[PDB]
Structure formats: structure tokens, C-alpha cells
Design a binder for this molecule. Structure first.
Ligand SMILES: Cc1cc(CCCCCOc2ccc(C3=NCCO3)cc2Cl)on1
Ligand SMILES: Cc1cc(CCCCCOc2ccc(C3=NCCO3)cc2Cl)on1
Lengths: 273, 40, 255, 236, 273, 59, 59, 57, 40, 40
């Protein structure tokens, strides 16, 4: 492939460099339209800018935490982090979010990796070996109330059991209801006067919910869960302007008030170098 | 070799090697030729 | 003697002529078309009023003055009240449509000024409150009036800051969306053909707008000496290939 | 039972590796795809669309005005604007090009810089745009500027001028984050003759300026952008 | 292959052993040009002197250390070794360095092995099990500030998570900007009067940066990281004189003052055996 | 699931072994090679060039 | 001995995965199947039989 | 596979929607027996409702 | 590839792709045609 | 068998078995024959 062809002096009536940008086109002008060039080859394919590659590496999408401790007398397991959850989403944390929102609709399979590490902030004789159980409670399923409810039987709901310190990995097909996931949605769930706007209304997909299977030892053990997400088989439509201001909320486009100028001011003139 | 039955479980896809910027760079209704005048 | 410059668009029972055009943009290089069976889901036969809905509606005019910040209309909202297009809209459960948008602004060879005319698929607005305040329905359904970016923040309304496109992105990059400029010195109209763009084959016309049309002054209007300091901008829009499906009782929407 | 040996690296999680995994939802059938206009395949497809450069960076809070390069009637010989070419920083940084370049470590290729004139139709002007390849200072006067890559632009019916910064380089890749060894030059613009307004007209006229990449362009070695960060996880 | 051919008495006008070294050549003289030889075969190929073999074994290129401890009240994580880094380089430690600098330009893929072991120098009830996370912050990426910054999300930057006591291994293609890496560079980054000289100016490639993912336990744990590097697919040009004096700095050729004579003095005469 | 048995040596790191590894930079394209005079392939090539001997070591 | 590398997820138990296992009862012979009317293959077969709706829910 | 065929107005002596449930059958009535439909395809096989799948986790 | 000798040890079965609701939805002795009168 | 997609991930290269010391041992412009006089 040639990156530049050889081209010499020109004295024409045919001027490729004068255009009318009002038309909305970006005319494909090249170095050889306005200087004299020599042949050179590309030596490159643009492999690593493919959208599959761009969205295809694991990104941290969520960090949560649960603890193993005596539940005796706990009136609210959920509240003691005897177990927890994450009503799923991927707007949660912002590095991957800016990448996805370069597109309007996106379609892909997900590969999740879940790393779990334990901490024992206060005096323990040892480090126990805990097994985590992460189950996905698809909306409608009967969400779970104590850390050892009938829910955890998970007879119809996919669940994975792995050890703290290890990693769990599995992959979920594209579960969207439509043909693509909306990265943006300028609508409502119905025409009510006070219903919510954006896409937190469309991105209702239950949520994964973790717990330790082990009963309690004499000390307490903090287990912190990190969920990583990798898109595989990516398809993206309609590019948009990149995010300039900071994010404030999962699912709304809102930016913070009295934010700071995002364009760097010159130290000098327009004329400055 | 796929070891698994479902398609979601296969590895990453392989390069589009599609590449056609004209839907974005030249969505004009009447075709513009480089070198010919923009507005006639 | 054909110029890129003169054009005629006849759609239904209405025709537009421009003698100072700058080509026309067809979003993503695709022209509006009906919904193919292979893509269909709802089993209902759809209704295609054709020429009674696919004609040109001219919205009320705006006034560009030296202080203007820009205006924003949403589709199909802007047309919610135009003739039979609008009736069909409130009466069917689902509908689908593409449009021809023609923005008009003429001046003289002594004026200067340049407007950006852009179509943004799925333009989800931001609340000026920050945090996770929502933007109420009425605020994103201004109707033919559209939203005036130089109007004041209101409560439950969107933010109207132009350098941020009403969503946290910079004005400068709106050029990645199908768009055309109106530069008084060149141009006097802008025309964009919009194919139907959605993640579902057909949708509700009232709970979801699928494009915002935005006209933004970028190089300020500058009139000749002792000229009146303003120009009107007119927007005329025509639904094209419209289909409605799931007819019934007639939606009632807030406000 | 087949005898195996495990190597160094067993059990590691590399966020960039690409392997098979069991599906959690065996046998599930995804929604059919329908057609949607606009599919993107390569980031190289989109960085060829031009976007506006806030060249007039001299303001103090972001404003529509930093996109406008002003021009003065009747000045002769003088300089319209100047900038270095660190596409990952400074004026370029918020543009779509700048914004994507920042996802990669290295770039190579030609850039296309165009200027669209917005002055009254009955005015006229001749400007010179000059590209100064690495090795010399930003030009200080047109004489200096005109000895490097340049285009005399004659403002006419055809409203925009497209200047190309041809890839001039020893090393075949430059770093996107500004680096010296790897630096690309300067871009300046001067009156060639001068802007002239018709009667009954007055004041400043402005140029809009765009940037996009030539088909020439290469970007490689993906990394994280300095353009976005956060202090606590967001919630709904 | 014959190592020596058979050759007998000679009384010629053709003298292969008289040459003129002023010419710059090393004339290919053999035993059989000056004594009577018998046939013998080589029995050898020179396999283990191939440059791929010479540069192809893992060498330790870096030892760093980080600790897991309560960051509460630490004003400078980087400074507490709550995490660290290494602006990469391979002049760092000298065994592999002398080997590479036998050549001027070198081109190869790298295979890294990272061994991490833990130490608990002061009273602990136990040994905790820590997961290390090593990410590569390519220059320009937004380098990381606390041990748990958004940076560590590493949504676009390759990172590996492995356990202390284990090893991590992965391989990075030749990332040089030119066609080869310069082992030497007699230049500057530009013609300034005070800019730095050598190659630390050319070998700007960011740096890898490690941390422990675990929160803190009651005791403190020292984790010491050793990075090993193996060249694979080696290509080397222009041999040079081997390094004689000791090294003082990464990237400069400088040797220490009042160094010692590097040539061993005879214990005796020139005539001595 | 195929039945396996691991042998002695599993998990060891031998600095001299030669195996495959995942690339950290999937799909990256290295700079083209250009021609450079002087390529060395074997150390046996270079030890045939003669160099001076500090024979007079007595200093 | 063939060189291997284990990936993330090794040792996990996913209740939805489908693999082979050793039989605890090697060589056992199950009872023959006889014919029984009524075999169901898909839940989609049965949701097409209509059943009564307690529409008058007001009790 | 078609999920619905195209069907238009009807004015017949052949009424598929009147039945006698006392018989014990569930007559296979479709949208196209009582409204005007357009063609649409199934795009689906019913894989995940197989009893092997239902009892197999 | 089965690694094991017994049939119980193989993975899950594969979709019936049988599907015939008529034993449940139309177990009537004399065949009913849709469109013809239910009771003659 | 390569298990990985990228070339960097393959094992060590295989012996040049190239070997030609003359660029280093005899870079003279006019060819010298062993046995013939060095300087004529
Ligand atoms: C954009 C965008 C991205 C997403 C998230 C999609 C999540 C799909 C469902 O997620 C899961 C399904 C199953 C499991 C699971 N099954 C057994 C263990 O975990 C986990 C998750 Cl996160 O939603 N919108
Ligand atoms: C000579 C010479 C040798 C070198 C060093 C080359 C280093 C290349 C880049 O290094 C890395 C890239 C990625 C990773 C990495 N990705 C995930 C984990 O580690 C690590 C390193 Cl050291 O530079 N000059």
C-alpha cells in the first residue's frame, strides 16, 4: 500500500485544495495535492484501532465489599455487608464509560472476571479460606434477604462459587432487550409528567449479588470484590463528540455546576507558539 | 478450537478490516469531485 | 447549467426552491426507507398516509440577533401539531419516520455570520442542577417552539450552555454529526435528509424523540452599517416515509 | 491421565489476553440485529471527519469565541495566529482528533488543517499559511515563514482552504504526549496582502479552523487518556 | 565439515602468512598454512553463540518494593511505597547491560517474568495472601497518585493481577519508535545548549507501576518485586568494543574517576611466562 | 473436562526455558525494519576480527 | 510432560456450565425405558394449553 | 420461519375464532385470524425452554 | 471427545428440537378443523 | 503450535545459521587473495 505517491510541480485550473466546508463534507485532501512528494508505503494496517480491539480489554467496572462475621443479632444482613450487591451498570466508573460513549448504540457479549481479596484489619490468628458465591438475580426473580436465604439455592439462576484470592470468569451473551444497548436515550418510560429521563430507565437488568459461603470464625474478615468487564464481538453505531466535562451520575449526561474551563488558555497571544 | 457450545463464549472477534469513512466524511447528496469547484 | 446551488424539493403537495444551496447532507449516507419485514417485530399491518403526512411543515420563525445563543428542536416533537402528521402521532401506539430538514436564512453581500445546522441522534440533555436531577418531560417536549438556548435556566428543564451541547461535550466536536453550515457569504439554506435511526424497528412517538435539530450562530451576525441588527431564521421540515402502527384511543401526554 | 507441567504465569489475569469462557446463560437467544445507519469499524474512520479547533484560546472561561480567529482590515505584512503542533495538547487537545490521539501512545501521518472564511461576500483577502518542520523556531515574520511549507490562500467564492501538514520526520513515529525529540513543528498564518472590507461595512471578520487526519495516519499502542478521571464511583 | 584438511611440506613463492595489517583486514589464515596437518572434522555448529541464544535467557532487570499497610494519614502513597514504579529501562543493572552493549542497535520482542515474594520483618500472626497488580502507564497516560486512584481501573492500559509468591509472565512486542533500539546515541533531543546527551533522551517509554490490591491487615507486609527480561526474535547490528570500566549511570557511557587499571600487570617481565 | 496429572517442576521459572506467552499489546504494529549495514548473527563471526593485545603489561 | 498455563476462572464452580465427569457407578446398567404417553420436550409445548384465569379476583 | 403471515380484510362464512372449549381442545388461533397482519419472522428457536436446559443447571 | 467410558458421564443432551403440543392442546378423538364449526 | 495470535508471543527464534564474518574481517575495497602479496 502506498502512503504517498510521487507527485511533481502543478500549474493547473484544477485546484483540489479550495473547497466549501459549508457542505458538511471533509474532502479527502493529501500531501501530494499541495507539495511535491516521493513514494512511501504504509507498512501498517490499523489493526489496533478496530472497535473490537478498542473495547476488547478488561476494565474495572465495580468494586464492592462484603464481610464474614457472626450474623447473630444482625437485623439487616444487607446493611451489615453480610452480603451485597450491585444493581448492575457500566456507567458506574468513568474510564470505560468515556470509551463506550464515543458511540450511541453498542452491541457485544461480555466476559466478566471477578477478583476477590481478603483483608483482616484487626488482630486475627490467621487468614481463613473463604469461598465467595456470586449469583445474578434477574429482575423479577425474588431478590435475596439474609446471607443464607432460600434464594441462594439458585436453582434456576446462574451462580459461580470461587475462593477469595482467586478469580472467577465466565461470559454472558448480549442480554439487551433491543438490537443494541442505548448509550444514550432522549426519552422516558412513558408519557408521565414526573417520570425519570435518560437511560437509567432502559438499563434495568437486575443485579448481581455476592456473599461468603463460610460461617464465621472468631475474627472478622473483609472481602473486597472487583468486577472487570471485557466486550467481545463488538458492534458500534453512530459516533458522537467525546465527553468533555466530568460525570455526576450513572445514566444522565449531567455535568457539575461551576465546573472549570476545559479548554487550556494560552500563556500568551493567539500569535504565540 | 472452540471448547464451548455457545457463541458468546468464543474469544474476541478479528479485524473488521472494513473501513469506509465516507458515511462520515462525505455524506453529501450530490457527489463532490476533488479538484472540481465545490460550488458551481 | 445545474449548480450545486439551485435546488427544488417537491414532497407531497409542497415544494421548496433554493437558489443558493451548498449541496445537501444525507445522514450517514442513507436515505429514508420503510421498515422491511426481515426487521419487523410487531405483527400489525402499518398505515402509510403518504402524501398527507409527507409534505413540508414550516415552523414559526426565529430571530437571529447579535446576542443569540442558538435554538434546539426535537423530532418528532416539533411536528406534534402539524396537520394529519400530528393526529396520526397521538392516535397510534407506534410510528416511524425520516425527514427532510430545510433551514433558511438570507441576508445580503454586506452581512457576515455563520450558523451550524446539525442533527444529533439520541440527544439526551443534561439537567443544569448537576448530580442526578432529571429533566422533566415538558422541558424536552417544547413542540414547535423548540428550546431557546439563550432563555434562562428553569426548574426541571435542561442546561442551555452552548459550549457544551446541552450534554457535557464541546461545541467544536458537533461536526462529527451530519451537519451543514449557513455562511451568509456562501449559503442561504441548509438541507439534511434524516433516515430513521433507532435500536428498535419502530417506537413510541411521544415518549422518545430520536433526533434534535440544532441551529447555532458560531460567527456572530454582523450587519452592514445602520442596517437593522437582526435576520429571521425559518425551519421547514417534512416527514418522509412515515408509517404508523397500533391504532387505538389517542394518547394523553403531560401538560 | 495425560502428564502436564504448568509454566510461570499460570493463574495470572492479564486484562488484555483473549480466551474462551463458559457462558453463564447456556442456550439463550439474543435479540435479532436490525439495520441502523452509521456503523463505525475503526477509530481511523472517524478521525478523518474534521472538527473545529478552539484556536483563539486566549479567553478565560470556555466560550464560543475561542473558535473564532479574528482578522483586521487593512493590516499588511502581519501575523494572524501561531501554534506548535503538539496534537495531544494545547489547541488540538479537545478536538476529536486530539481526543482520540490521546487514547494512543504513538502517531504518524499527515494532518489536514483548513480555514473557512466568514467575512462579507464583497470583501477580499490573501493569507499565507506556513508549516515549519521541526528544527527551526516558530517563524517570527512572513519572510521567515514563507521559506517552509506554505499555501497563498486567495479568499473567494470557494470559502475554505485545506492545508496539509505533510509528514516530515526522521523517526517514523512521534509520541502523542508532547516530547522534544519527537516534536513536529509550528503552524503560522500572515496577511499576504491584507483583508479589505466593502463600504458600509466594519469591524472584525473571523475565520473558523478545522483539523482532521489524512488517510496516511497511523496511531498505535493504546493507553489511558489524561482527559478523564474521577474521585468516587458514581451512582444512580 | 572439515575443521582441518591434510597438508604437507611447502616450498613456495606463495606465502599466505605474510600480510599487511595496515589494510584493516584480518586475513583468514589457518593451521594448515604454516604447519603440516591431518584431516579432522568440526563436529560442531556454533548453535549457542547465535545472538538469539546469547540474548535469549531471562536476566534480572529490576528489583523494587512496595508494602501493604494502613494508608490512613499517609500524605504521599508513592513515598510510603504504598506503590511504586520503575520508569522502565534496562541499563538499570549491569550483567545484561554489558551483553547488549556489544551491539549498537538491537531489535527484539520482550518476554517479562515478574516474581513477587513477601517478607514480614516484624511480628505477624500470619502471612496474608496478597494479589499484586502491575500496570504499564505509557507516557501520556495520566500517571497514578494514590494506591487506589481511578488510574488503577486501567480500562485502556494492559495490567496483570497475580499473587505474591507466584510469578506473572507476558510478552510485549518491540515497542521502539525507530527500526531498532539505540544502544548508543551521540546526539541530543534538539539543538539547545543545556539539553541532556546520550540516550536517556531517546529511551522515554513510561514505566510500569505496581501496587497490592489487598486492603491492610493488622501487621505490615513487605513485598519485593523482581522483573526478569528475555529477548526473543533478536536482531543486532554493528558490533563494538566490550565495556571495560564500571558503569555509573543509566544511559551515559561515563565511568568513575580514579578507577583502577583494568589490564592486569605482569608479575615479572615482558619475558615472563 | 480432560484428565491431567502435573509433574515435578510445575510452576518453576527456569531463566533458560523458551515458551509462548500472551502479548500484553494485542494487535500492535511494530515499526518497519529499514536496512542497516553491519548485522551480527553469531559471536563466532566477530571473534575472527583481530584486536591488539596489551602484551607489554609491565606498566 | 506437556507445558500448560492455567487461566483466570480455574477451579471455579459455575452452576450452569456443562462438562463431563467420572461415573461413580462404573458399568451399571439402567432399567430399560418402557413407553409412557405424555412426554414433554419444551416448556413452549405446554404454555399453549389454555387454563382458567381467576379474573374475578375481588374476593 | 414466519412468526406472522400477511393477512387482509375477511368477510367469510368460515369463522376460526368461534369454538367450543367444552371439547377439551385449545384451538390454534393466531393474530392473523382476527386482525390484518404483515409478515414477520421468528428469529428464535426455543432452545432455552428445552426440558434438558430447564432441569440441567 | 468423551474422556470417560460410561454414558452418564457425558455432558448435557442437545435440544430435543422435538416440539409437538398437539398431545396436550388437541387430544380430541374426532379431528377439529379451525374455521369449521366446533359442534356440527 | 502457536496458541496465541500475535507474533511477539511465540518462542525464541531458531539459529540464524547465517554467519559471514567478511563484513567485519575483510571490508577492503580491492579484494585480497591469501598467498598473493598484500601490497603490490
Ligand atoms: C452498556 C451496558 C453494559 C451492561 C451490562 C450487561 C450485563 C449483563 C448481565 O450481567 C451478568 C449476567 C450473569 C452474571 C453471572 N452469572 C453467574 C455469575 O455471574 C453476571 C453478570 Cl454481570 O448493560 N449496559
Ligand atoms: C534496550 C531497551 C529495552 C527496553 C525496554 C522495553 C520495554 C517495553 C514496554 O515494557 C512493558 C510493556 C508492558 C508491560 C505490561 N503490561 C501488562 C503488564 O506489564 C510491561 C512492560 Cl515492562 O527499552 N530499551
Amino acid at each position: 500500500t502506498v502512503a504517498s505517491i510521487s507527485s511533481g510541480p502543478k500549474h493547473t485550473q484544477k485546484v483540489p485544495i479550495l473547497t466549501a466546508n459549508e457542505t458538511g463534507a471533509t474532502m479527502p485532501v493529501l500531501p501530494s495535492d499541495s507539495i511535491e512528494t516521493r513514494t512511501t508505503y504504509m507498512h501498517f494496517n490499523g489493526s489496533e484501532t478496530d472497535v473490537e480491539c478498542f473495547l476488547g480489554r478488561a476494565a474495572c467496572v465495580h468494586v464492592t465489599e462484603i464481610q464474614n462475621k457472626d450474623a447473630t443479632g444482625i437485623d439487616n444482613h444487607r446493611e451489615a455487608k453480610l452480603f451485597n450487591d450491585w444493581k448492575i451498570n457500566l456507567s458506574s466508573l468513568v474510564q470505560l464509560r468515556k470509551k463506550l460513549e464515543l458511540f450511541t448504540y453498542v452491541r457485544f457479549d461480555s466476559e466478566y472476571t471477578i477478583l476477590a481479596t481478603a483483608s483482616q484489619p484487626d488482630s486475627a490468628n490467621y487468614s481463613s479460606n473463604l469461598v465467595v458465591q456470586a449469583m445474578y438475580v434477574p429482575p423479577g426473580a425474588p431478590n435475596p434477604k439474609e446471607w443464607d436465604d432460600y434464594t441462594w439455592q439458585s436453582a434456576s439462576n446462574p451462580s459461580v462459587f470461587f475462593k477469595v484470592g482467586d478469580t472467577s470468569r465466565f461470559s454472558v451473551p448480549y442480554v439487551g432487550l433491543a438490537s443494541a444497548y442505548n448509550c444514550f436515550y432522549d426519552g422516558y418510560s412513558h408519557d408521565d409528567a414526573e417520570t425519570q429521563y435518560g437511560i437509567t430507565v432502559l438499563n434495568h437488568m437486575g443485579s448481581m449479588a455476592f456473599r461468603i459461603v463460610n460461617e464465621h470464625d472468631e475474627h472478622k474478615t473483609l472481602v473486597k470484590i472487583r468486577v472487570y468487564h471485557r466486550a467481545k464481538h463488538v458492534e458500534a453505531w453512530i459516533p458522537r463528540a467525546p465527553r468533555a466535562l466530568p460525570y455526576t451520575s450513572i445514566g444522565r449526561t449531567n455535568y457539575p455546576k461551576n465546573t472549570e474551563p476545559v479548554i487550556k488558555k494560552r500563556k500568551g497571544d493567539i500569535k504565540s507558539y | 478450537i472452540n471448547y464451548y457450545k455457545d457463541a458468546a463464549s468464543t474469544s474476541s472477534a478479528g479485524q473488521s478490516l472494513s473501513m469506509d469513512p465516507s458515511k462520515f466524511t462525505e455524506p453529501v447528496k450530490d457527489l463532490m469531485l476533488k479538484g472540481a469547484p465545490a460550488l458551481n | 447549467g445545474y449548480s450545486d446551488r439551485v435546488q427544488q424539493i417537491t414532497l407531497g403537495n409542497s415544494t421548496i426552491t433554493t437558489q443558493e444551496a451548498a449541496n445537501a447532507v444525507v445522514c450517514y449516507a442513507e436515505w429514508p426507507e420503510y421498515l422491511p419485514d426481515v426487521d419487523a417485530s410487531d405483527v400489525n399491518k402499518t398505515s402509510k398516509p403518504d402524501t398527507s403526512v409527507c409534505r413540508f411543515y414550516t415552523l414559526d420563525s426565529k430571530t437571529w440577533t447579535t446576542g443569540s445563543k442558538g435554538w434546539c428542536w426535537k423530532l418528532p416533537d416539533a411536528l406534534k401539531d402539524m396537520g394529519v402528521f400530528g393526529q396520526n402521532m397521538f392516535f397510534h401506539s407506534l410510528g416511524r419516520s425520516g425527514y427532510t430538514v430545510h433551514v433558511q436564512c438570507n441576508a445580503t453581500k454586506f452581512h457576515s455570520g455563520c450558523l451550524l445546522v446539525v442533527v444529533i441522534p439520541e440527544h439526551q440533555l443534561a439537567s443544569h442542577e448537576g448530580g442526578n436531577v432529571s429533566v422533566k418531560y415538558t422541558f424536552t417536549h417544547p413542540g414547535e417552539r423548540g428550546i431557546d438556548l439563550s432563555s434562562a435556566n428553569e426548574v426541571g428543564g435542561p442546561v442551555k450552555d452552548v459550549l457544551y451541547n446541552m450534554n457535557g461535550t464541546l461545541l467544536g466536536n458537533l461536526l462529527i454529526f451530519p451537519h451543514q453550515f449557513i455562511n451568509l457569504r456562501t449559503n442561504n439554506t441548509a438541507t439534511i435528509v434524516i433516515p430513521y435511526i433507532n435500536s428498535v424497528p419502530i417506537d413510541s412517538m411521544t415518549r422518545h424523540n430520536n433526533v434534535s435539530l440544532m441551529v447555532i450562530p458560531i460567527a456572530p451576525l454582523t450587519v452592514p452599517t445602520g442596517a437593522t441588527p437582526s435576520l429571521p431564521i425559518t425551519v421547514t421540515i417534512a416527514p418522509m416515509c412515515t408509517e404508523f402502527s397500533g391504532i387505538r384511543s389517542k394518547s394523553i401526554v403531560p401538560q | 491421565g495425560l502428564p502436564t507441567t504448568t509454566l510461570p504465569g499460570s493463574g495470572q489475569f492479564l486484562t488484555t489476553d483473549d480466551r474462551q469462557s463458559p457462558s453463564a446463560l447456556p442456550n439463550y437467544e439474543p435479540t435479532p440485529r436490525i439495520h441502523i445507519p452509521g456503523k463505525v469499524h475503526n477509530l481511523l474512520e472517524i478521525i478523518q471527519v474534521d472538527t473545529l479547533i478552539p484556536m483563539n484560546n486566549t479567553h478565560t472561561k470556555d466560550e464560543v469565541n475561542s473558535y473564532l480567529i479574528p482578522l483586521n482590515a487593512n493590516r499588511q505584512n502581519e501575523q494572524v495566529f501561531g501554534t506548535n503542533l503538539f496534537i495531544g495538547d494545547g489547541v488540538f487537545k479537545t478536538t476529536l482528533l486530539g481526543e482520540i490521539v490521546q487514547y494512543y501512545t504513538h502517531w504518524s501521518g499527515s494532518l489536514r488543517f483548513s480555514l473557512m472564511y466568514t467575512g462579507p461576500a464583497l470583501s477580499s483577502a490573501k493569507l499565507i499559511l506556513a508549516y515549519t518542520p521541526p528544527g527551526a523556531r516558530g517563524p517570527q515574520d512572513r519572510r521567515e515563514a514563507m521559506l517552509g511549507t506554505h499555501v497563498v490562500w486567495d479568499i473567494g467564492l470557494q470559502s475554505t482552504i485545506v492545508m496539509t501538514i505533510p509528514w516530515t520526520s526522521g523517526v517514523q513515529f512521534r509520541y502523542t504526549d508532547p516530547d522534544t525529540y519527537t516534536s513536529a513543528g509550528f503552524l503560522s498564518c500572515w496577511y499576504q496582502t491584507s483583508l479589505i472590507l466593502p463600504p458600509e461595512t466594519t469591524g472584525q471578520v473571523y475565520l473558523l479552523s478545522f483539523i482532521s487526519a489524512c488517510p496516511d495516519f497511523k496511531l498505535r499502542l493504546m493507553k489511558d487518556t489524561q482527559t478523564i478521571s474521577q474521585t468516587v464511583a458514581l451512582t444512580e
